[PDB]
Assembly symmetry: none
């Protein structure tokens, strides 16, 4: 019964857990259908072939690119279904244009050519094992039924949509098991007639829109009561109607605002859904706020229209979300693309019918041809939401469909949009299809029945090797204050508290003829006491976050790092740090994670030289009398290929790594000079400022690394083809992307458990087996009802995946250090919160404690 939908915004304004919000596991139950979509003018092409009737869009495209040459699907059954066999999908959704068989203004002579076409297609689908989802209308109209009957304003056309739909049953037979009569009545009514953005009409008032919608909904009642009285006795499939429906969230979360949102949903979705499943009447709000421009039913058709459906077919995507949609219907509410709460609302408001999503998917621009990760990740998110509705919301779904099997013409966005699963170029006369990324992803999602648990996606028990390192990070410690620090570290079970010094504060002028020994003796006492409380400090020396790159004013004014002499300015300062503190350290970090897409190359040369001098110094003068190791902590945020089976993604991933990680790693770790692909790309693109290495420099840099502090915060995705003008970095020809289905942060930084294990394996595949630390890893707050529900997942899964690397691959770890043990020096990122001048343990910190005292997952 209506009204209970008000609980949907409540029930999905408070996520019970991120576990269920993501739903990284689970499978679709036995008998969950899968289909792929296609429209009657997106992909068919041709206007007079073999006797085709003219479309209203044939009339529309001529003067506001065309469908007289649209993808070539009217003559060949094998080419299209080759894509299907590659997909292995159980079902295939398409349409039938009305003008094709009956073009006249009286439903004249049927043309047998399209009939043989569709019989061949259905027979092929039978052979390969594909069942159809036919749609007797997709934004079409026979022109001769338009210039005489005034379009869908007049009633008689519902009679036509009766008879032509009866023959639609008789011509295609009984193997057509699922049916959808009117596809998206809302746009065809309003934007078809009122605004004129869709084919018919040029302009009108909302009166025409409401009348067209009334007439279409009556035509649906006609065709339903046709099927249920004349054809079903020899049948047993279902029939429904697809109602397109976006979803909105309120503005200020108030009762009036939720009322406005319910009103908008009824005005876009409820508009036809209410008198089909519930009572046979238009909604109360359209009765009230629309005074007399909304045609009302009589008691005979009030009953004639009720109950005329079996399952609920739902249409979703870019058709009327963030796209063509009456701005007066949103009633000043936020449009947002979510399908889980939407499915829950549709299931609650209609006495629990079964749901079938008959159109879903996003769009990629007209310039991208083969690699379109936008569509893959939107489809993955949509299937995730459908599964979460099946499992966590009790929305009994019967199947899912992905839209635009074949590229085409998005009506208003004309040809400037490409949506197909299979790329077709507009320069080929065969219109030859080629597989894309989306097709491969859908293939590997079908055959595995959703997202089944995988060896990597399933926790494998195991213990950590002894002497494993532990600790946490505060790279901004304020320099009395030591006792609460050590109390919070020892309380956290920390053995290697990570911090730095902010060198700029060590030396006011950058010279060692003067020093403010206060902070120096403070660090001395700090390290010493930490050892008395048994903490060996992971120490850093230089930080990347500063308006002057973190140098003293005098050392910054003279070319902070571009200058040659600054390298020695680092060197001697290192000697300082190693001659005073040199006893209480067992691990050092000189250049603590410099950023790698804004720092100039020539300065990078001097940074590597500085590292070389510092290492040679602490080796040839202090290592023998003071034990220890000294190496680098380099930024190694994993770059994954968007298409895991495309080569150009692999190459661009290599390049962006060699500029992020390899740029400051290849002379330190490997051969001793820059990576190959970075210099190849500098030279081939005729853009270059990099220095080269001289033999003395090469022998200076190479071979100084005693450990490897991989720094991994999140995982980013690369794409090779331009899709956006502002965010496709031309210099590297790189398009940065973040997947949408992952659990995200309130600051939009992704959590991916399996990332680390990859960047680990890579960094062994490249620089040989060696003791590896994971030095930086920590997400911020999340899900502001309990700020720990995401960091518990974060740690629980990242450390597990690290164990997984340590067990299944042989990547010899040494330790792990989560980031930001507090918020006061790290907004939103802490473990202990800072509230009212006090540090307070949040639950994820307790989870950390459990793992640390367990020293890894307690084995069998």
């Amino acid at each position: 019964e209506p009204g209970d939908g008000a609980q949907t915004w409540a029930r999905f304004s408070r996520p019970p857990a991120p576990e269920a919000a993501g739903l990284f596991q689970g499978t679709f139950p036995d008998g969950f259908l899968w289909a792929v979509g296609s429209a009657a003018y997106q992909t068919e092409g041709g206007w007079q072939q073999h006797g085709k009737g003219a479309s209203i869009w044939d009339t529309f495209t001529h003067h506001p690119a065309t469908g007289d040459v649209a993808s070539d699907s009217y003559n060949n059954v094998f080419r299209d279904t080759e894509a299907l066999r590659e997909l292995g999908v159980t079902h295939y959704r398409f349409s039938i244009s009305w003008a094709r068989v009956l073009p006249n203004g009286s439903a004249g002579v049927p043309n047998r050519e399209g009939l043989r076409y569709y019989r061949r297609l259905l027979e092929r689908l039978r052979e390969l094992g594909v069942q159809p989802v036919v749609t007797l209308y997709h934004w079409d109209l026979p022109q001769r039924l338009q210039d005489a009957y005034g379009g869908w304003a007049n009633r008689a056309l519902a009679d036509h949509f009766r008879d032509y739909a009866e023959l639609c049953f008789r011509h295609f037979g009984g193997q057509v098991k699922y049916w959808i009569t009117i596809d998206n009545p809302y746009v065809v009514a309003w934007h078809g007639y009122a605004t004129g953005r869709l084919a018919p009409g040029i302009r009108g008032s909302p009166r025409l829109g409401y009348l067209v919608a009334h007439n279409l909904l009556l035509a649906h009642a006609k065709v339903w009561h046709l099927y249920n009285t004349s054809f079903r006795p020899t049948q047993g499939g279902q029939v429904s109607i697809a109602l397109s429906s976006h979803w909105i969230n309120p503005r200020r979360m108030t009762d009036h605002s939720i009322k406005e949102c319910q009103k908008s949903l009824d005005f876009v979705l409820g508009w036809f859904a209410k008198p089909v499943f519930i009572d046979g009447d238009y909604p109360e709000s359209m009765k009230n706020n629309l005074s007399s421009i909304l045609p009302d039913f009589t008691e005979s058709e009030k009953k004639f229209i009720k109950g005329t459906a079996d399952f609920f077919a739902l249409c979703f995507g870019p058709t009327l979300s963030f796209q063509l949609l009456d701005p007066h219907m949103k009633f000043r509410q936020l449009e947002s693309p979510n399908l889980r709460q939407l499915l829950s609302w549709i299931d609650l408001e209609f006495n629990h019918p079964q749901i079938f999503i008959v159109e879903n998917g996003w769009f990629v621009s007209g310039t991208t041809k083969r690699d379109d990760a936008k569509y893959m990740y939107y489809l993955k998110k949509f299937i995730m939401e459908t599964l979460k509705a099946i499992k966590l919301d009790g929305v009994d779904v019967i199947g899912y469909t992905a839209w635009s099997l074949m590229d085409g013409f998005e009506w208003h966005r004309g040809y400037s949009i490409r949506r197909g699963l299979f790329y077709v170029d507009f320069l080929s006369q065969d219109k030859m299809l080629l597989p894309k990324s989306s097709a491969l992803f859908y293939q590997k999602l079908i055959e595995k029945n959703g997202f089944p648990p995988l060896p990597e996606n399933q926790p494998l028990e195991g213990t950590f090797p002894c002497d494993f390192a532990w600790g946490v990070v505060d790279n901004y410690i304020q320099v009395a204050a030591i006792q609460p620090q050590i109390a919070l570290l020892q309380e956290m079970h920390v053995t290697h508290f990570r911090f730095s010094l902010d060198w700029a504060l060590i030396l006011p002028l950058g010279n060692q003829s003067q020093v403010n020994h206060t902070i120096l003796q403070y660090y001395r006492c700090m390290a010493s006491e930490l050892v008395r409380v048994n903490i060996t400090p992971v120490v850093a020396l230089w930080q990347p976050m500063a308006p002057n790159q973190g140098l003293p004013r005098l050392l910054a004014r003279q070319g902070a790092w571009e200058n040659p002499y600054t390298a020695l300015a680092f060197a001697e300062y290192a000697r300082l740090c190693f001659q005073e503190l040199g006893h209480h350290v067992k691990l050092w970090i000189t250049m603590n994670e410099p950023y790698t897409r804004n720092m100039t190359y020539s300065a990078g040369h001097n940074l590597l030289k500085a590292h070389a001098l510092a290492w040679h110094v602490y080796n040839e003068k202090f290592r023998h009398a003071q034990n220890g190791k000294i190496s680098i902590a380099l930024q190694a945020d994993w770059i994954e290929p968007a298409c895991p089976f495309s080569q150009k993604d692999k190459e661009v991933a290599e390049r962006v790594l060699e500029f992020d990680i390899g740029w400051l790693a290849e002379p330190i770790f490997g051969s001793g000079d820059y990576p190959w692909v970075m210099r190849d790309w500098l030279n081939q693109r005729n853009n270059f400022l990099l220095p080269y290495f001289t033999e003395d420099e090469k022998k200076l840099i190479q071979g100084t690394f005693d450990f490897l502090a991989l720094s991994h915060y999140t995982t980013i995705l690369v794409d090779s083809e331009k899709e956006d003008p502002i965010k496709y970095n031309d210099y590297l020809e790189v398009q940065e992307m973040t997947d949408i289905t992952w659990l995200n942060s309130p600051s939009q930084v992704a959590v991916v458990p399996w990332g680390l294990r990859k960047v680990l394996n890579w960094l062994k595949f490249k620089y040989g087996d060696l003791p590896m630390y994971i030095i930086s890893n920590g997400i911020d707050d999340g899900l502001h009802a309990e700020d720990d529900q995401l960091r518990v997942y974060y740690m629980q899964n990242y450390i597990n995946e690290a164990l997984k690397a340590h067990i299944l691959d042989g990547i010899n770890l040494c330790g792990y250090f989560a980031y930001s043990f507090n918020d006061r020096t790290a907004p939103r990122f802490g473990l202990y919160r800072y509230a009212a001048d006090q540090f307070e343990p949040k639950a994820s910190m307790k989870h950390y404690r459990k793992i640390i005292d367990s020293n890894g997952f307690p084995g069998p």
Copy 2:
């Protein structure tokens, strides 16, 4: 008699010689007055002090910044005249506002306070030896005489300007020897009333403008016939009226066009000048084209107005040139600021009266405070034109005046423009004056009575030292063709013909595994034959003018000069040039004059390295078996300080030199590293990409210079304060300027004889005594009636000044060279012209020949 002015545009459309066009010498005859200017409402300030009457400006400024606090000259006689004593000027021009003594609408009670002020000022001027030039009106009007008499539309105000001008004689006595009654009647009429850009009125038609002008000219007749009948029997001084007058050149130089220009001159200047000196009638053109909106005289006043002046006072400058001026009066002709031909026209059209220029000078913007070279050079040009009119045009001038002794509120314009000779800041309560550059220049121009011949500005005879080098330049020689070349060189008496190779053409790919030996053997034959005809070729190796900096395509695509390896790519190519041609050369140039404000620093490092490698190569492997010298030819266009007595100009000159000349000279010539001031400015401004020198690099670069080829084309001027948004180079905080009084070129490149001697002395003061060549020096065509009249001056004076350096300073020269021995490879710059596929000797080439065969000026 009128009409003879048509010969002025002819007589000054053909310059008889540049000698007289510049007039670098000459002095003002005995009894040539000098004065300085000041307005009545730009520098005085105050509106009610001691009983001052309100101005029409006081009413104007309130709503279209003010003169209620304008410079403080109403209470203090010593502060203003301190500037005068610093100036030592014989005379001082100022004004008297009308409202000050008489503010009423009936010429009411006189106020004795301004009277004591002006008596004190006149007594001080008497003591210091300063005589006045009083002006009884400058744009003013008493308000009570405006709101009752309708401003200068009505006649009675000329009666007022009668009586108030009589008292103006009686109150100030007889020591007031020169008088000007109405200052600039044209603007006060038209822009005072018609447009309303000047104080009175808000809007009107040209009718009001013509009526106001008629009334002002009648008031001038009244005051003149007052003076000549009542006061002169006891006062022998003169009286006149200042008529402001711009000057125009025709568009297409046609009889109708000269008629239009004469018409415009009569409509702006002749408007009042014709009925004062000639006949007592308005001009014929204003009678014809102005039908009935121009009040005509009667026969009684026709005679009353004639002959009412003694000398002609002329007003010139930014008042109505390129500024406030009726756009309908130019009759579509070009406004241009020349005063010589203007003075000639005024002298020809008025039966030869004596002329006095009572307002002249340009303006500098509101942001510049102390260094304003614009005003110095405009004043120098104006005095040059006045002298040229005295000497070459028979315009008997009686004196000159410079405008705006004190900065201040510009009628219409506003404080926006600073024009004073003495800077006054608008934050000081004393309004304390400070000297400027213009004041010092005027001081040193007065005491020397114009431009008297100076030891540097007077040719001093002398012979050149034997074995002095000779030759000319063609850096673009096309690679038979040799015989006319050598015939034209030997014909010119050339011993060291300067040329280059265009290295990019030597090697197609930049590798010496392949070479097009055609041009190489052509150069071989060329040098050899030149030696047979006794020419030792000054050879160059690399040219700056190219879209790829002159490298082969392959050597350009890979970082032409930023790359390290390109240095060796130069090195070996040098070895090539030295191993084949190595016999027939006695002077080399590797990096022939690279530009020094667009070439990147990092590439400059590699250029210096290339020079070092090439020099060490040709020294350690070829110098012993093949004699010769190899050095650099560096761009050393002299930078002169705009203010020869200001220090900041000196510092910015040093800096722009060290970046132009010193940048590629200090590591080669001097200490071996970059200049001090350039690195100090890179570091203090926190903008820096320069490299530093490593000890091996320092020992590589330093000490390889065997001669010094100073390249001096022209002389540019620097200024330190911003004056223009687009042409004040912020990075160096440098404002580039070219003096306006010099002879220029049709391509605007200055000729300055004394330049070379300066850049010579400097380059000895900096890099020690050493054999110096002047390798590139020449100008293009000029004065298109005979294209040689400027190059003869050019050579005749540049080589003289070089001799002067060789005699008076000890700058050991070796050999001079002029540029562009032909035009075909040097547009407009040649000596032999290229006309109809033929080389033809122009006269300046013959002058060159005379000097060369004379081998310097034949001594006593």
